[PDB]
């Protein structure tokens, strides 16, 4: 089944988000299958820098190294990659729908709370990035006998 | 007043979300006038099956009757009918938005937590076939002086 | 499994609790297996009037018949009779605690928003009264398999 | 910073919303900076009625005269005006999104929750007819530092 | 009826709960007769400050002036002193029970979000302290039909 | 400054309550300086399994290995072990009181919920059995200011 990456950035720690948004996708019926909280290193930063221009995440991976840890996951689920997107809302807060966690939690694109993968392709490789194999857990959750 | 009929499927029940469910339309303001919680019957779902091509609800009920309760409603207000839609979301949960019943709980179109009437010829028909008359209550709301 | 009869009295209809009611015991892992919005009759009143002096309840019936509608409810589950009376609270709103549903939602005992049956006798002879054999549904709740 | 002026209506206040329509501006990351609860006299409706006909909540606040308090409120921050707005959803309930504070509470247009300010233009023009310049509180709040 | 004063501390405004205090009463059906947010002045403070040794709270008033302001409240109903301070908790935050505000979101007795009046008798004095007669609204609450 | 040791048993994920007990420990102000999902293994059980006489946690730790991932967590905080033990409520959630995590979503002492550390002395043992010390981050969260 498809998974993707997603992210509390160092505001949404420390305006003390990480449970509201963890509900938002267990709610939705989403499979957790990764979670850490972690501080992001030089050495996870310098992996993809190079490729910031194309991607503007590997970008702000290098100001997470000084401003404080991130809460990193993988969730799994049909369509969860676009669906996460969805539930996240517009990149911009201030185009951001209510409903949607950057609409009702965020203001500016600066401290705009979480990143989640853009598509299959950057979901993989991100996964790769922060996660060893052996930290995702593959297990049954019973309740998708109702969710699918 | 114009009334509605909401159906919590037996997926929104085995998932525990008639609390939720029926907390959003008490919050909106509009007033809850028939409700119990039942299982639907071949003599139910045998009224309409024959309609069944123009109107796939009552292929579905065929499938309900095997697999668990539905929690059926009937709700009363102004314009109830296509508010009620507009609150559940696109059919498809990956095309609702975030905010509504289906964005916020549903993944896939099959299990997609509850089920409202399309208009209001539908449900004068769907409240007929769940509900006597005797088991719709008739009864003012004090509210509803400040709700219109 | 063991069975209690609980009521939102109509006061908590009117205030519309009804959502965040069902909701307290769905998070909570119980099981509902009857409901239903219904007036309160002289028929039903009468039935145990008399015994009205040793169980204030059916004295609480009489006042119902014209005040409004109730939503019936039968709840299953381990220890659910006393437990039910736990998350109600003290039926005194002003000495229950915070978190219970008369704590949370109640100030006076004229208006205390719910009932639920004291002993397991008396959720027998209540449920008895508001629901007739066939309304109450027999399933199985899959995520049992997590509660017990 | 960018100072909107936002208001429960008298059915805002009388279906008891302050505090989860304050919480949802909290959450957001928004500054309140001016908060009151305060009935709507003769002298402050006739300070603009005769521009009615082109601002018609001048019109609405002769009607609130008579029927109630409202919770006058301003609040601060980038973008603040329009995002209230966005907030707020439709004027017209039946047209707001689900999500928003109409959308998720309000039925009709005559009892529709809440007021805010259309433009800049007009926020100051409202903070000025219902606020004195020493009711409005000037402080730093902390957590602007991961809002900003 | 009775009323009680009401006050989120600077550390209450800063963290952002006054929606969800606010929620709280108006969810458990008291009425909310002033509001206001302001800023505690040497004035306000050295009224009672000669008192403090008798009861502390003249004494945090000193410590509000330079850091930040308070949401002051006046609420109104049956046994609304007594009611207020269950619902708050114990003082020290360790002491006081989940499902209180207190318990709920206080840690230390130094920053513990909030204070009410401890008797009618300073309930009394505290309301004459923050709040001018004109600024206390007298409204009926259609609700309390149901509350009542 | 003190830290306990708080783990969501296969139970609490299967039923989907991780981002809810998160948030409440977010919303009491304590701080997040640990965090993984994880499978417990015959490694890890076997390192204390000799002491379950003494330490029931230890015997549980063995009917985890095959039933599901656990949420292990560690907060930090003034009083943290003992605070936690009350927001958990009683072992047996039957006697839990409303407002904890046991008296909230439990319903037998088989299947609780959660654990977390009884002493101090505990707490340090069972951090060094689940988290290495470079799994832990130290950070400043700035929020403290109004929490301390």
Same mark, same amino acid.
């Given at each position: 089944? +498809?998974?993707?990456?997603?992210?509390?950035? =160092?505001?949404?720690?420390?305006?003390?988000?990480? #449970?509201?948004?963890?509900?938002?996708?267990? *709610?939705?019926?989403?499979?957790?299958? #990764?979670? *850490?909280?972690?501080?992001?290193?030089?050495?996870?930063?310098?992996?993809?820098? &190079?490729?910031? +221009?194309?991607? =503007?995440?590997?970008?702000?991976?290098?100001?997470?190294? %000084?401003?404080? =840890?991130?809460?990193?996951?993988? /969730?799994?689920?049909?369509?969860?990659?676009?669906? &996460?997107? $969805?539930?996240?809302?517009?990149?911009? =807060?201030?185009?951001? &729908?209510?409903? %949607?966690?950057?609409?009702?939690?965020?203001?500016?694109?600066?401290? $705009?709370?979480?990143?989640?993968?853009?598509?299959?392709?950057?979901? +993989?490789?991100?996964?790769?990035?922060?996660? *060893?194999?052996?930290?995702?857990?593959?297990?049954?959750?019973?309740? $998708?006998? /109702?969710?699918?």
């Amino acid at each position: 089944m +498809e998974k993707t990456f997603l992210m509390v950035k =160092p505001d949404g720690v420390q305006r003390a988000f990480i #449970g509201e948004i963890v509900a938002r996708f267990e *709610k939705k019926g989403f499979q957790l299958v #990764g979670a *850490k909280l972690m501080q992001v290193t030089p050495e996870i930063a310098g992996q993809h820098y &190079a490729e910031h +221009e194309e991607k =503007p995440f590997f970008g702000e991976l290098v100001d997470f190294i %000084t401003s404080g =840890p991130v809460f990193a996951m993988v /969730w799994q689920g049909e369509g969860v990659v676009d669906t &996460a997107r $969805n539930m996240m809302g517009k990149t911009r =807060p201030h185009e951001a &729908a209510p409903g %949607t966690i950057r609409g009702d939690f965020g203001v500016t694109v600066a401290k $705009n709370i979480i990143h989640g993968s853009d598509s299959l392709e950057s979901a +993989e490789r991100e996964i790769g990035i922060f996660f *060893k194999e052996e930290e995702l857990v593959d297990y049954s959750k019973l309740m $998708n006998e /109702w969710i699918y």
